[PDB]
Each structure stands twice: as structure tokens, then as C-alpha cells.
């Protein structure tokens, strides 16, 4: 058997295009304080972000529809996302070490996966 769980999670930036019409994207964000970055903390089962299959907890949102969010505040990030229109083009980059500082008892294992004890 060949298990995905052993393979490294790609750390390069990716483009994700979510088509969600006029409903929520279906994920949570954390961060935004002092340019620390905006990270995905939670993806809703069955929501547009889940259906894309291309975002995960620990992804940093680098931009939405060309709008750089690397140094965004949490509220303006949310506004940017909520008002991005029916087609939402996200550049994301997996940053589990940075993300893990937000969630209690969390750490990164050898494959780059976020583990919570």
C-alpha cells in the first residue's frame, strides 16, 4: 500500500479558484495582528472551499483576486474574502509552523502535517 500521509505536503504557492456564487466560502481564518499573516484554521465539510479540495488548515492566504493579504488585518481580510465576488481566486501557501502557534498543543510532524496532542 502507498499512503499519502507519508508524502510531504507541497510548500510552494498555489492558485485556487473557488466558484461559490452568493454563499460563504466555508472556512475560518486566524491571524492578522502585526503582519503575522492570515491562515486557514478550519474548513467546513461540504462548503465551497472543501469542494475545491485544494485548501487545508495551515494554509496562508497570500492574496484574493490579486489583493495582497500577506500583511492584512483579520477584519479587512474577512471583508476582502466576503466581497470577492462569485469567483474567488486565492493564492495560498502552506505554512504549518507559523499556523501552529495559534492552535493549542499543536506542532508539525516530519511530513509537514499539523498534529494536535
Amino acid at each position: 500500500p502507498e499512503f499519502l500521509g507519508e508524502e510531504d505536503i507541497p510548500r510552494e504557492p498555489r492558485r485556487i479558484v473557488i466558484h461559490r456564487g452568493s454563499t460563504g466560502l466555508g472556512f475560518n481564518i486566524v491571524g492578522g495582528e502585526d503582519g503575522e499573516g492570515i491562515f486557514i484554521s478550519f474548513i467546513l465539510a461540504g462548503g465551497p472551499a472543501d469542494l475545491s479540495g485544494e485548501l487545508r488548515k495551515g494554509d496562508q492566504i497570500l492574496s484574493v483576486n490579486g489583493v495582497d493579504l500577506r500583511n492584512a488585518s483579520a477584519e479587512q481580510a474577512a471583508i476582502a474574502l466576503k466581497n470577492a465576488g462569485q469567483t474567488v481566486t486565492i493564492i495560498a501557501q502552506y505554512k504549518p509552523e507559523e499556523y501552529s502557534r495559534f492552535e493549542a498543543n499543536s506542532r508539525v510532524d516530519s511530513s509537514g502535517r499539523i498534529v494536535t496532542d
Binding site: 460563504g24 472556512f27 475560518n28 481564518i29 486566524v30 491571524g31 495582528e33 484554521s41 474577512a78 466576503k82
Partner: peptide, 6 residues
């Protein structure tokens, strides 16, 4: 700290 659903 701040967390929001989108």
C-alpha cells in the same frame, strides 16, 4: 487574536 468565518 481574531478569528472569522468567511
Amino acid at each position: 487574536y481574531k478569528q472569522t468565518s468567511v
